[PDB]
Design a protein around this nucleic acid. Structure first.
Ligand code: K
Ligand code: K
Ligand code: K
Ligand code: K
Ligand code: K
Ligand code: K
Ligand code: K
Ligand code: K
Ligand code: K
Ligand code: K
Ligand code: K
Ligand code: K
Ligand code: K
Ligand code: K
Ligand code: K
Ligand code: K
Ligand code: K
Ligand code: K
Ligand code: K
Ligand code: K
Ligand code: K
Ligand code: K
Ligand code: K
Ligand code: K
Ligand code: K
Ligand code: K
Ligand code: K
Ligand code: K
Ligand code: K
Ligand code: K
Ligand code: K
Ligand code: K
Ligand code: K
Ligand code: K
Ligand code: K
Ligand code: K
Ligand code: K
Ligand code: K
Ligand code: K
Ligand code: K
Ligand code: K
Ligand code: K
Ligand code: K
Ligand code: K
Ligand code: K
Ligand code: K
Ligand code: K
Ligand code: K
Ligand code: K
Ligand code: K
Ligand code: K
Ligand code: K
Ligand code: K
Ligand code: K
Ligand code: K
Ligand code: K
Ligand code: K
Ligand code: K
Ligand code: K
Ligand code: K
Ligand code: K
Ligand code: K
Ligand code: K
Ligand code: K
Ligand code: K
Ligand code: K
Ligand code: K
Ligand code: K
Ligand code: K
Ligand code: K
Ligand code: K
Ligand code: K
Ligand code: K
Ligand code: K
Ligand code: K
Ligand code: K
Ligand code: K
Ligand code: K
Ligand code: K
Ligand code: MG
Ligand code: MG
Ligand code: MG
Ligand code: MG
Ligand code: MG
Ligand code: MG
Ligand code: MG
Lengths: 181, 258, 109, 163, 166
RNA sequence: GGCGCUGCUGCAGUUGAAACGCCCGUAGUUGGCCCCCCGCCGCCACGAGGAAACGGGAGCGCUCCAGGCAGGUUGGA
RNA sequence: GGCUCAGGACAACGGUUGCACCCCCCGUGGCGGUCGCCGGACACCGCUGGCAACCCGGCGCCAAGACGUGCGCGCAAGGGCGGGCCCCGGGCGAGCAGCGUGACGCAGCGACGGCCCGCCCGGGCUUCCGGGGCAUCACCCGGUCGGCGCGGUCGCGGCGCGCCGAGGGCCCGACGCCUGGCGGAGAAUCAGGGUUCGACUCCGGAGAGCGGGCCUGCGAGACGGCCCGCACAUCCAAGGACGGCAGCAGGCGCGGAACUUGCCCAAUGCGCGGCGCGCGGCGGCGCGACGGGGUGCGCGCGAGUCAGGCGGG
């Protein structure tokens, strides 16, 4: 990388998400309904005792394909091993888009896609749809109708193979339409 | 099945092997080794079906037993041995030294060469990786490997090999403007110059070339072997990789009987 | 299978038996054949296996298929072995040379 | 035998699905090791070769204190917590992720160097340290790990509280 | 499978839709008179071969004058028709492939060639002499009555010099 | 196939068989006119990539032929 | 390799993806560092036996490119730490692969040097689109839909188990029932648009009387391998042993309906290595079907007969 870190006078000051993350971890340690203790496999957990700030406290990465990371996942405090940005899974294969059909599961949504079929004898079309279940990271929050882009991953359940990587929101009460794309 | 496949029906054989639909129910199935099963032509189908040195399997075998066939400077004794692109074909009893190239319909031709020519081999750099204890290797299109490779050698380039000592002497860089010949597709056997390398995230990269008479064509980057740098390093058949169209071909088929 | 039998009871038509602690014992049936191992023959006729002369091509056998002893060390076997042994050092000589070669490449790069 | 073929599951709409072949060998399941604490390591021959080590009755393991960077070997004393069930705790069954007490004798020379985690030092002054298993005993025949620290230590101590 | 399972084979004649129709039932025996035809299958066969060249021509003529498929199959079709003598030299355009008939196919049988050349008294005599093996085509002896003679092999019809007739 | 007696192309519904007794109404189907030179679908063309055989199709007198890939520098495009 | 189409309708199959979730013999190309010639014993064979026949017992003298142990310069699996705290070359689109350093362990290769690694063909699973009839089948499902954790697997995954939640599919036809349902490449018909069939040649799947289980091996849930239940048959001194023609010929039965109980591995291919091969070939039966030529012309032929070539194991 030829260019290198321009200078503000506040960067070590804004470096206090370290204390934010530390206290979030200790509150999760004080939560006692939870059966097990959730933490990222990428982080020592001995980094939460030092004070020199020397080393990182949360892990993230970029997935490529021209998709930028969200600050909500960079600065969040949730433990999710199925997140594409802060988890332990990868994106490869197909990337498609659809509308959020339902959002009633834990960290999981249904994406409805629409398409056409040509019947040559009749020289005409019929409109068709399929359902596609997907995993939703806590860094996103969606409702019904919002457009979402989902990318392929390895199996994650009996029905899930895709993962949400972009949400283009749409206002409520809009006229439901075919919207094929 | 419950295991690997040994047999091969004649109809299921590759189309470019030019077998004939009568004359058997079976075909020779190539053996594993230096080349694949689709982009190759076996040794027996070169000797017995092309040059008539043997009129049958039962006497092609013995030609290979007393070790009459040098491939890449080393003998071979397996009738189903897969010889492929750029392999050297020298039989000394009839004083014939060849290299394998493609014709302009996607078939395997044997070009004559000289003793000053059969001293090297062109290979396509398939990939660069790390093995035991952290060492680099280059693996190529002929299933050769070279360790401690010069760092300038990068993936998809071409190397020049000595058949005896097994070491690299020259290398050619795949850039915009290199004389190159295709190996698959429906432009197999045609030669042009790299003048576009268009890349796509996640998916295949496409390559656009042109012959020396203006005709242009496209393919994947998996099918562009590099032969020189604005001049080929090896010999090529007197058609030089220019394809005629169907009517020009038809008049030539008319001439050869006229 | 029906492997049957008995603890040597009634329904035992036929049986096998061996005499210990000896009309009676008077006959001998010779050792039909002879040994055939380099070590074997020597330990047999009270001879070692550590002094450099293991040939022992004496042929008695009482001339009676069945000789051609085994594991008998020779000049040919010795030399051939040495050949392989040495080779399994030359390999590494040139390999560990090439290590330095590539180190120097990088360092000048 | 035991199988993990999906053909015996229903679809995503609840419908019974049909049966179009007989059990294949490449979808076999085996029974699990159920590694008892306190020395056998069986060998299992898997698909294509591939020795798999399958433990029963382990007693020792290699344990690492990371922030101080000290590793010693030690005798697993007792399994005290497990996230799945109380049954695997009550039986002292060695599975990945369970929390155990290890012998303190190996780590007692670290009791000298100060400026260290006092929550580890006062526990070394006793006769055990709290640690987590990081290995899979039924697949590799070994139980190694690290000593707890951070919020995670406090979480498991509160789970162990005299409630 | 035995290797004989892979051989191609095919029917070469088409039977008319309305069989009992007087007006062409009469002009159909007229052709069996003006040549020596055993039965009606040899008129069916001639209609069959005319139908295909007609179909190919209509396909090509749907197309456009500068097009490659015209440039390829029109030249091929005319060359093969001219060398079989179904079409003569002065008509070198595709639109003339439509106005042919059965009769110009029949004209190039051997039974017609040797009657033009006067080698036989008639057509029935020509038939019998054909099967008697007395007329050769250019040094090779041709037993076929239905033989179709290229206008290259048309100068070399004569009695087979191995015959009781020289 | 005849058969436009299954009708997309292309049937019939006053009396031959056949318009729901009527009004409201969701899914579905359909929806005037307008800005051009942006984006995302549909559509049109041209490519790349993957199997022969069959179906077409260039060349070749198994004496013709149903065939076969022959053959006299070749070829199976 | 051969046979068959019974089962199975969001299967399979066809095109189109992926494994940064995997496994693999042979062959090709690499790589090879590992904390003085050993040991006894097995089959063939000798001497004696049991048994109706099936099949075996006891004693003994004898080898290895068979085991076992192992001579050797430390490196198999797994595990702890070693990353950047707007966001973006060993190798990538992608933090992937190596290495270093603290602990464990002692595996594999070595008695004629090979553990190991790339490529290859093959497999497993996997994304998307296509993927029978009935509404006198309108609601359906409950490991069912998602989450956490371990286990098992070559490996991912409700695949399995514990705990938490209440989801998931549906008139764009769910679910259930029926099929005299193998899918595709294809075939029949014929201006154009269409209708119907996909037994069998190639590819893919599935089975070996019907449920199941497994050993050996790189690879099988193998049936010309083994073990058990069921339904059927076979020899037998009555105590016992034993089978799987949906392989080729041939028999029975069924039905309107389908040939020899031949010869050869000479080609084509495969195996191992000059042979073996009911693959595959060559003859026999064969008006299913296809193609060609006669029963005369005005005076010569083919249909048959007998000889010799040619061809053909
Ligand atoms: K996380
Ligand atoms: K679509
Ligand atoms: K669409
Ligand atoms: K679309
Ligand atoms: K579409
Ligand atoms: K529609
Ligand atoms: K799940
Ligand atoms: K699930
Ligand atoms: K709509
Ligand atoms: K099969
Ligand atoms: K397998
Ligand atoms: K196999
Ligand atoms: K075939
Ligand atoms: K064939
Ligand atoms: K082979
Ligand atoms: K042979
Ligand atoms: K199983
Ligand atoms: K089975
Ligand atoms: K299996
Ligand atoms: K009709
Ligand atoms: K019509
Ligand atoms: K009407
Ligand atoms: K009326
Ligand atoms: K009525
Ligand atoms: K009405
Ligand atoms: K109505
Ligand atoms: K109404
Ligand atoms: K209304
Ligand atoms: K209305
Ligand atoms: K609508
Ligand atoms: K409508
Ligand atoms: K509409
Ligand atoms: K309207
Ligand atoms: K379009
Ligand atoms: K093929
Ligand atoms: K059969
Ligand atoms: K079936
Ligand atoms: K059936
Ligand atoms: K194999
Ligand atoms: K093999
Ligand atoms: K799939
Ligand atoms: K899918
Ligand atoms: K799929
Ligand atoms: K589908
Ligand atoms: K229905
Ligand atoms: K449950
Ligand atoms: K699970
Ligand atoms: K459960
Ligand atoms: K539940
Ligand atoms: K339905
Ligand atoms: K049936
Ligand atoms: K229609
Ligand atoms: K039509
Ligand atoms: K049509
Ligand atoms: K019609
Ligand atoms: K019609
Ligand atoms: K048949
Ligand atoms: K079949
Ligand atoms: K088939
Ligand atoms: K087949
Ligand atoms: K097949
Ligand atoms: K198959
Ligand atoms: K099959
Ligand atoms: K099967
Ligand atoms: K079955
Ligand atoms: K059975
Ligand atoms: K069965
Ligand atoms: K079974
Ligand atoms: K089983
Ligand atoms: K079974
Ligand atoms: K059957
Ligand atoms: K049957
Ligand atoms: K037979
Ligand atoms: K009968
Ligand atoms: K009968
Ligand atoms: K043979
Ligand atoms: K046979
Ligand atoms: K005569
Ligand atoms: K005669
Ligand atoms: Mg469609
Ligand atoms: Mg075949
Ligand atoms: Mg009609
Ligand atoms: Mg079908
Ligand atoms: Mg079998
Ligand atoms: Mg039998
Ligand atoms: Mg009957």
């Amino acid at each position: 990388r030829h260019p290198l870190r321009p200078d503000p006078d506040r960067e070590r000051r804004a470096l206090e998400r370290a204390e934010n993350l530390r206290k979030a971890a200790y509150e999760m340690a004080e939560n006692q309904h939870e059966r097990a203790y959730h933490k990222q496999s990428q982080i020592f957990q001995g980094r939460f005792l030092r004070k020199d700030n020397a080393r990182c406290l949360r892990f993230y990465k970029s997935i490529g394909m021209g998709y930028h990371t969200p600050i909500t996942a960079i600065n969040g405090t949730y433990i999710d091993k199925k997140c594409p940005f802060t988890g332990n899974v990868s994106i490869r294969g197909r990337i498609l888009r659809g509308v959020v059909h339902s959002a009633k599961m834990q960290r999981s949504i249904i994406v409805r896609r629409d398409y056409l079929h040509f019947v040559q004898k009749y020289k005409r079309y019929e409109r068709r749809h399929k359902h596609v279940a997907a995993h939703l990271s806590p860094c996103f929050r969606v409702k019904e109708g919002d457009i979402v882009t989902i990318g392929e991953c390895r199996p994650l359940s009996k029905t899930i193979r895709f993962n949400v990587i972009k949400v283009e929101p749409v206002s409520e009460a809009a006229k439901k339409r075919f919207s094929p794309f | 099945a419950r295991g690997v496949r040994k047999h091969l029906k004649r109809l299921n054989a590759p189309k470019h092997w030019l077998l004939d639909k009568m004359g058997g129910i079976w075909a020779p199935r190539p053996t594993n080794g230096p080349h694949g099963l689709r982009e190759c032509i076996p040794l027996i189908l070169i000797l017995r079906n092309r040059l008539h040195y043997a009129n049958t399997y039962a006497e092609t075998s013995m030609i290979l037993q007393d070790k009459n066939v040098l491939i890449d400077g080393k003998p071979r004794t397996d009738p189903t041995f897969p010889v492929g692109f750029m392999d050297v074909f020298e039989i000394p009893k009839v004083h014939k030294t060849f290299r394998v190239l493609y014709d302009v319909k996607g078939r395997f031709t044997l070009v004559p060469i000289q003793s000053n020519e059969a001293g090297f081999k062109l290979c396509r750099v398939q990939k660069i990786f790390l093995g035991d204890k952290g060492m680099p290797y280059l693996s190529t299109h002929d299933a050769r490997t070279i360790r401690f490779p010069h760092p300038d050698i990068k993936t998809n380039d071409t190397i020049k090999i000595n058949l005896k000592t097994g070491k690299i002497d020259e290398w050619y860089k795949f850039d915009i403007g290199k004389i190159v010949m295709v190996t698959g597709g429906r432009n197999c056997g045609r030669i042009g110059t790299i003048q576009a390398i268009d890349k796509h995230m996640g998916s295949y990269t496409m390559i656009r070339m042109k012959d020396t008479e203006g005709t242009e064509f496209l393919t994947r980057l998996c099918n562009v072997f590099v032969i020189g740098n604005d001049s080929p390093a090896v010999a090529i058949p007197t058609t030089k990789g220019i394809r005629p169209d169907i009517i020009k071909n038809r008049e030539l088929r008319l001439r050869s009987i006229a | 299978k029906s492997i049957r039998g008995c603890i040597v009871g009634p329904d035992l038509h036929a049986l096998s038996v061996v005499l210990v602690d000896a009309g009676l014992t008077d006959v001998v049936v010779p050792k039909r054949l002879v040994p055939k191992r380099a070590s074997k023959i020597r330990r047999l006729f009270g001879l070692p296996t550590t002094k450099v002369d293991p040939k022992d091509q004496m042929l008695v056998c009482e001339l009676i298929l069945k000789p051609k002893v085994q594991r008998v060390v020779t000049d040919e076997k010795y030399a051939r072995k040495q050949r392989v042994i040495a080779e399994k050092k030359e390999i590494m000589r040139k390999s560990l040379q090439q290590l330095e070669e590539y180190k120097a490449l990088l360092s000048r790069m | 035998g035991i199988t993990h073929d999906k053909m015996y599951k229903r679809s995503k709409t609840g419908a019974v699905q049909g049966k179009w072949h007989k059990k294949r060998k490449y979808n076999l399941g085996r029974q699990p090791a159920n590694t008892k604490l306190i020395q056998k390591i069986s060998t299992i021959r898997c698909r294509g070769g591939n020795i798999k080590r399958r433990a029963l009755r382990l007693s020792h393991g290699s344990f690492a204190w990371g922030s101080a960077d000290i590793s010693h070997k030690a005798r697993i004393l007792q399994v005290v917590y497990n996230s799945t069930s109380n049954e695997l705790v009550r039986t002292n069954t060695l599975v990945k992720g369970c929390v155990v007490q290890i012998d303190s004798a190996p780590f007692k020379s670290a009791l000298s160097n100060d400026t260290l985690d006092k929550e580890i030092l006062d526990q070394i002054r006793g006769d055990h340290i709290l640690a987590r298993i990081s290995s899979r005993p039924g697949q590799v025949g070994t139980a190694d790990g690290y000593i707890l620290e951070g919020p995670e230590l406090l979480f498991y101590q509160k789970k162990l509280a005299p409630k | 499978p035995r290797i004989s399972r892979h051989r191609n084979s095919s029917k070469t004649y088409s039977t008319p839709k309305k069989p009992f129709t007087k007006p062409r039932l009469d002009a159909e025996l007229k052709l069996c008179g003006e040549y020596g035809l055993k039965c009606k299958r040899e008129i069916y066969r001639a209609r069959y071969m005319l139908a295909k060249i007609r179909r190919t021509a209509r396909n090509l003529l749907t197309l456009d004058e500068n097009d490659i498929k015209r440039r390829f199959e029109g030249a091929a079709l005319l060359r093969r028709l001219h060398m079989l003598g179904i079409l003569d030299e002065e008509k070198d355009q595709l639109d003339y492939v439509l106005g042919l008939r059965i009769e110009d196919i029949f004209k190039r049988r051997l039974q017609s060639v040797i009657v033009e050349s006067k080698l036989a008294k008639s057509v029935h005599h020509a038939r019998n002499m054909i099967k008697a093996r007395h007329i050769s085509v250019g040094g090779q002896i041709v037993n076929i009555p239905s033989y179709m003679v290229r206008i290259s092999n048309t100068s070399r019809v004569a009695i087979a010099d191995t015959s009781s007739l020289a």
